[PDB]
Paper text:
At present, the best structurally characterized pLGIC is the G. violaceus ligand-gated ion channel (GLIC), of prokaryotic origin. Each subunit consists of an extracellular domain (ECD), predominantly in a β-sandwich fold, and a transmembrane domain (TMD) composed of four helices, labeled M1–M4. However, the GLIC is a pH-gated channel, activated by lowering the pH, with a maximal activation at pH 4 and a pH50 around 5. We instead found that proton activation is a complex multiple loci mechanism, with the key contribution stemming from the coupling interface between the extracellular and transmembrane domain, with E35 acting as a key proton-sensing residue.
The mutant of the vestibular pair on the β5 strand, D86N-D88N, yields a significant decrease in pH50 greater than 1 pH unit. All residues were also tested individually, with most mutations having no significant effect, although a large majority tend to decrease the pH50 (notably D86N/A, D88N/A, and D91N). Mutation of Asp/Glu residues at the complementary (−) face, in general, decreased the proton sensitivity of the GLIC, with additive effects in many cases, especially for D88 and D86. However, the pattern of phenotypes does not allow discriminating whether those residues are involved in proton sensing or gating, because mutations to Asn/Gln also produced decreased proton sensitivity. A structural analysis was performed on E26Q, E26A, E35Q, E35A, E67A, E75A, E82Q, E82A, D86A, D88N, D88A, H127N, E181A, and H277Q mutants, by solving their structure at pH 4. The key mutants at E26, D86, and D88 were solved at pH 4, each showing a structure similar to that of the Wt. All structures were in the apparently open conformation.
Author numbering:
A (entry chain D), B (entry chain E), C (entry chain A), D (entry chain B), E (entry chain C): 5 to 315
């Protein structure tokens, strides 16, 4: 079979629409998500036109094999989509209405800069390669773009599912390609991070600061070193749920900065002891008394500065 | 092939039934479960009717290819079900009795609020898209809905497998869809959580409270900090077996609250020492003596309050 | 094609046999094992009978397509078995000898009560659904049931592979089903558990008891708390290799009971110190001296009681 | 199609050859390896003989469907090999030259006794089931058995890839089976184990022995217990990269034996303290002085004994 | 179908080109990467030639089935590539222009010597087996070799994608093979390693050196042993993200060398204490004072030496 013939030198417009049924498995490390949706296609093939009076029927159904169907592919998919044709319906003028149900693992990159308070725009790119007979251009039928109300992406809030109506028409391997951008706007459910990582991490830091109300070096060493190890465990736990980024993430910055607070606490604890031993407990007392105010104040201000730079 | 013709303008009723053979792999993190069941379908096709006297036979068997079979799909499945036809049997009036054995990874969400003392309702949604010739409506043949006695879901108790008999009939992409709800009610086997997480976690907390019967700061610091680290390990272990929820789980709340008890224990231990050093061991004694009663009482009451809010 | 016709009202006997080639991947957490075997089937179809004198040949080979083959399925498989037909041979009387090689992930539950000193009976259930023409019953041809000598299940000892010769005939969805039970009896290779978990766990416990020969509270606190943390690591390591059971496992019981020994050691260590501080080291000496005998004796007796209840 | 007819009562010889292209994913825990190779087959079928003068073509190419091809299977594979036919070439005498490229997950057991200084012989077993017309026997065409120079198995050194030329001809389910043994000899690259496990493990042990030059019980308890915990982590890390063996591995033995050294160090540390407290520091000094020589000497000799028993 | 006939004794040149659409999942442990690209093939088949005047058309489109297409395979792929034909276009002279879109898991080895400051050359090898009619040779059409601008390999910087234009022509199993080398040059994004592993690891080492400003043996033992355990955790974390190499990696060397610094710190701490006890605190003071300069200086120089050897 060959593509539909042009009335004049116009390109063939394939109207598209994606309707999400099930949306799942957003892997932060892999920057992938799995989708299960309907793909609807519509184009006019005058060769398929019929008189409803003579034929009796108002619409004609065809098997994919019987007629010409545009070779529509997804750009950013991992492997070729699993698709199964639901329906092909031809109206008297020759307007074909294709429907298929597909599933694919979509590869759309993520911006972890504000993690876990981040919002993402997932992309689904539809593309079509022009044949030698005629150029094929994609379009968006907005009435056939949507999502089910039940659509839930675990740990995420689905904001919108829309399409950039004007396609990106460009040359590739000496033939015209028409690309369409379907955007799924989502925002992370940060709630769990607060009682599981953020607050536990702050509690262990504040416990390290009880060393500023203790003259026992052996006890201080235990307090600051033990809590530093729990902070290492939280750093490791966090960096497992995330990929290696060439930039600093919000949680990454806080986690990093907290190491400096542990390092300065070890210095203060060491200075206090050296001075006590050197028979200068008065000077050690001044440093310890100052640290009690300095550490919380510098921690609070540094955090205001970070939140400001990141948001 | 085309769908059966209507006697009048009535829709075609496809009677359904699911009989679970094997139920397995409930992934809490993924909110998925795997099923292996029989799917039975029954509808009347007058075109297939025959006289049992003239034909000799009481029922006629057909291969799927020979006759019209309704396109039945699952809504909340991950990928398309794996199915294999067991039997197709036609009675003299034209009543078709289809049977297939399928397997699918079903995506039904879970409510972890009362974890690990939670009960779930897993869903299996059957759907059918109406064709242009006539509208197709689903029904439940209750005699063909059930589960095998051997059906075991590891770590769960299977309560019931029933179907909501009235289908959800709605419009989707300008065609009628008939959805059916099969509900598998299950309840978690919480027993293992008690000797593996709950009791070990309480033992480490009570060990931290032996610091209220000790005047040794060095020893107390070790007791409260070491046990706090073991509590961090239990928090991490628990949050690995669960997905990130936008709400507080029962175990999540207890685990979180226990951090506050560790934090206040560090404060008491610090106060006692500061006072002892400041040559006020009498005042430190009063605080330590009070803490011995305060800590268990506040822990017990806070737990009554939590159990009340959650159950 | 239709099933063989009955001489009288007797059911059709399909003689079966499974010969294991490769047996592997026993997942304790999932309660599954993978199998790679031969499935042999034999039934008489008089329609296929021939005279060896007239036909020249002693046996006739047929392709699955050509003749009627009973639809045999596995009950407890995860997905439908992967099978490939090796041979179909018809003798002059019409006796068909079918052979196929298959692989399947079999789902047979396990009893972890005596873990890691447990023995299991893995099951492979063959089933057949009766057609309307005639009822089909399964049988065991014992000469065609066996296993290869090389068959090795990693970490397990294969005791026997036998079949329960009388099938379980029952009604299901108003049709006779003939189920057969193939039993693979295996016993765990517990050897590795001894130097990797059991002996390391006992060594850390005995190290905690060196606190009964020490008056140093700071040192005792370190001894009992540090070793308690290593016991937590062993509890976590063990519960990862096992699923969540609604009953107590042997290792689970020992692991749990050992927590009580750590808890009582913390109490003794605390009592000794309180008494020493209260200027009563004589009374603290009596308690410490008693604990040196009490702890090993109670540990040894409690273990005799547990081994008795479990074996 | 039927198998080639015999000139006399001779069996049909299928000449085989495996040429490894890619060798990868050797899973120690699963005792599996993945292979990507060429499988070449050659047999004479006089029915395919042709005159090159009359036919125009020296050799004729056929699609697998067109002619009889022996059903060659792998014994020790997990699932059926993924294969794709490269070429089928028939010479005028009827000699068929089959070529296919396949990939399979081969299940060949491993001997971890000398781990990580072990050498393995991986096996690939080719088999063929005799048909009723005539018996089929396998052979090795040594010119068509080899491996690519680029063939690299991560963490292993590939020594040789050869075939045991004489097949194992045996009876199975009353039919002759011809098995062939392809052996891939490999040896582990132990180098990484030295700076990652062996040397770190020895360093922590030697650190524990600095307790023989210390009279501080509190410090010794910390030294021996802390380093014992690091040894537990190395034991856990090692047993994760390995399956549960019914025998003692070399690393397993060293790791186990080192626990006894930690246990005896705890005893010495306890004895020294008891004696110091009992006002017998002279006797405690003798024991501590002896331990300084005893511990390294017994460790060195025990290791000579182990290396001797294992190598 | 047979291959195109030669004008003379020349081989058939198949011009190739790979254009990367999506590049993803570079597994350091497995030494694999997943690719999703276009594969373009072009060769002359005079049998397909046509007069554009007589035929009307300028180019003729064919289905893969209709004409002869060279069997092109990838050498270093794991399983056979998943491919789907985009287009086949024949020009009047008989020049075929084939295009397919494929996905494959490519197995190309990596050099971890300079990890995480390493650069790699990933390879994609195209190959073709000569038929008996005529020899097939590969070529590079440079205009049809490229990559998409969006192509992102997580944690890596894509430098270039080029092809070694001269094929490797060699004999294999008595037939000519034409291999082509496509090279993807990438360099690791080391940035994340700095705040997550390198700086945390240096902070814990510097904390261990605060023992040179402390006379408290109990505190020093805690400082050096606790920080040594955190270094063990970083060693374990690092060796999990990497495969077992028969050579020393850059991070591996630094990590190893840091163990020696911990070992010597334990010796100094032990010597200081022995001397203090032996009533020689003056000599212990000299050693401690020297260590304060020696440790940072030797650490800094040893690192200069390592960076020099590795870069
Ligand atoms: C002057 C003391 C030098 C100590 C050097 C020790 C080097 C050990 C090399 C191991 C190589 C593998 C075996 C562990 C020994 C611990 C050393 C304790 C030193 C105590 C010194 C007392 C002060 C007089
Ligand atoms: C302990 C601290 C260890 C710090 C290691 C320094 C990195 C280094 O020295 O790495 C070396 C790389 C080299 O990059 P290249 O392009 O491959 O140079 C190849 C040069 N030839 C071809 C001439 C041989 O420099 C960097 O990436 C510099 C930035 C990283 C600084 C991180 C500091 C923390
Ligand atoms: Cl696609
Ligand atoms: Cl489905
Ligand atoms: Cl099955
Ligand atoms: Cl019954
Ligand atoms: Cl019946
Ligand atoms: Cl195979
Ligand atoms: Cl390929
Ligand atoms: Na078509
Ligand atoms: Na049908
Ligand atoms: Na059949
Ligand atoms: Na064949
Ligand atoms: Na072709
Ligand atoms: Na300590």
């Amino acid at each position: 079979v060959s593509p539909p013939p042009p009335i004049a030198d116009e390109p063939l417009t394939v109207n598209t629409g994606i309707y999400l049924i099930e949306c799942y498995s957003l892997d932060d490390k892999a920057e992938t998500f799995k989708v299960n949706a309907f793909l609807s296609l519509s184009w006019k093939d005058r060769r398929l036109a019929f008189d409803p009076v003579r034929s009796g029927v108002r619409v004609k159904t065809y098997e994919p094999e019987a007629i010409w169907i545009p070779e529509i592919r997804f750009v950013n998919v991992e492997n070729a989509r699993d698709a199964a044709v639901v329906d092909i319906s031809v109206s008297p003028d020759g307007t074909v209405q294709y429907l298929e149900r597909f599933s694919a693992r979509v590869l759309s990159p993520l911006d972890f800069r504000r993690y876990p308070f981040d919002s993402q725009t997932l992309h689904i790119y539809l593309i079509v390669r022009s044949v030698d007979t005629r150029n094929i251009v994609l379009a968006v039928d907005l009435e056939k773009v949507g999502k089910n109300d039940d659509v839930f992406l675990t740990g995420w809030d689905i904001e919108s599912f829309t399409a950039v109506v004007k396609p990106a028409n460009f040359a590739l391997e000496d033939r015209l390609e028409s690309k369409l951008d379907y955007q799924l706007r989502i925002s992370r459910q940060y709630f769990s991070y607060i009682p599981n990582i953020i607050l536990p991490m702050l509690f262990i830091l504040f416990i390290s600061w009880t060393a500023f109300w203790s003259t026992s070096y052996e006890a201080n060493v235990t307090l600051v070193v033990s809590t530093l190890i729990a902070h290492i465990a939280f750093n490791i736990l966090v960096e497992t749920n995330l990929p290696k980024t060439p930039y600093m993430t919000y949680t990454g910055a806080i986690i990093f900065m907290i190491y400096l607070f542990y390092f300065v606490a070890v210095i203060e604890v060491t200075v206090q002891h050296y001075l006590k031993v050197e028979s200068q407990p008065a000077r050690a007392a001044s440093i310890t008394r100052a640290s009690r105010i300095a550490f919380p104040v510098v921690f609070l201000l540094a955090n205001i500065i970070l939140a400001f730079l990141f948001f």
